[PDB]
Design a protein around this nucleic acid. Structure first.
Length: 276
DNA sequence: GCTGATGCGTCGACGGATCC
DNA sequence: GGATCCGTCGGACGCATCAGC
């Protein structure tokens, strides 16, 4: 029922040590999260790259603390065009990315502030906040439109350069990736359609599920728990937040964590260790 | 202009039907 | 009544907007 994450494995299968520490994290409000001491946690995790989801902040109103980070000088933000207070991703890197695109190059799917590409010397990092399917599955057909457009996008981008996809992808792939699989076959985030899109993306590109690639049988491994019904303490959660790697990066994979003791948000941080 | 009130977006506990 | 399968619904958040001062 409860979960304890394994010790950090900082050496690749080949014995090579880790060189990249990417940490992604849905903050459920960037200003509330900072008020909840989120960055004191981040400073201790000391990532090379910090990716953020559901910032719900405009580049104007960013808190000041976001400056007091001397290890992640290069910070790239992203918000919905229409209206304040929704969605919105961030990406903070220690070193300057060669390039920084935004969105998946598709007018329909870029208005909401969900995707940030970031090209590096040996790979490209995409951090995402995939559109939720919504209560009542009222936004479910949008999400399918998006799934295929995002699959097609990333497939292309992994042609050109090894791909690291991370962030809240808002589906739980298998029954194992959530606490209550049956009572949610029709909930946003575990529909047949959401689950098959992900499965399709996993192999069409192709991408590997960093965590389940090293811990393919370990359940109760959760990145999100709801805040209505005591779920986090009881460990009733979903695995909504991923690291998907091109198979080329698989020999470089040291470990993939789920830092479940870190509060600040209804999600918890997930860290990737890649030896590049 | 300030301040709370109400809203929008983001599911597991409970109870009722059913076959045994 | 007890096991399973399914349907509804109160309820927590962080944000914005808006009515009432």
């Amino acid at each position: 029922a409860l979960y304890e994450d394994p010790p950090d494995q900082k050496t690749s299968p080949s014995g090579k040590p880790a060189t990249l520490k990417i940490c992604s994290w849905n903050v459920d409000g960037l200003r509330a999260w900072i008020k909840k001491k989120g960055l004191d946690w981040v400073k201790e995790e000391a990532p090379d790259i910090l990716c953020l989801q559901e910032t719900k902040c405009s580049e104007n109103k960013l808190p000041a603390e976001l400056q007091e980070l001397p290890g992640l000088s290069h910070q790239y933000w992203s918000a919905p065009s229409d209206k304040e207070g929704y969605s919105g991703v961030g990406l903070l890197s220690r070193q300057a990315p060669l390039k920084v695109s935004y969105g998946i190059g598709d007018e329909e799917h870029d208005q909401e502030g969900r995707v940030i590409v970031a090209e590096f010397d040996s790979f490209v990092l995409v951090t995402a906040y995939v559109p939720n399917a919504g209560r009542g599955l009222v936004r479910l057909e949008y999400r399918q439109r998006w799934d295929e457009a995002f699959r097609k996008f990333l497939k292309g981008l992994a042609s050109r350069k090894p791909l690291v996809l991370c962030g809240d992808l808002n589906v739980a792939h298998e029954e194992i990736d959530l606490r209550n699989p049956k009572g949610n076959k029709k909930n946003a985030g575990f529909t047949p359609q959401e689950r098959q899109g992900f499965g399709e993306l996993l192999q069409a590109v192709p991408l590997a599920d960093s965590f389940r690639h090293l811990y393919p049988n370990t359940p109760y491994a959760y990145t999100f728990w709801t805040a209505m019904m005591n779920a986090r303490s009881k460990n009733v959660g979903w695995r909504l937040d991923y690291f998907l790697l091109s198979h080329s990066l698989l020999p470089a994979l040291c470990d993939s964590k789920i830092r479940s003791k870190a509060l600040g948000s209804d999600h918890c941080p997930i860290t990737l260790y890649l030896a590049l």
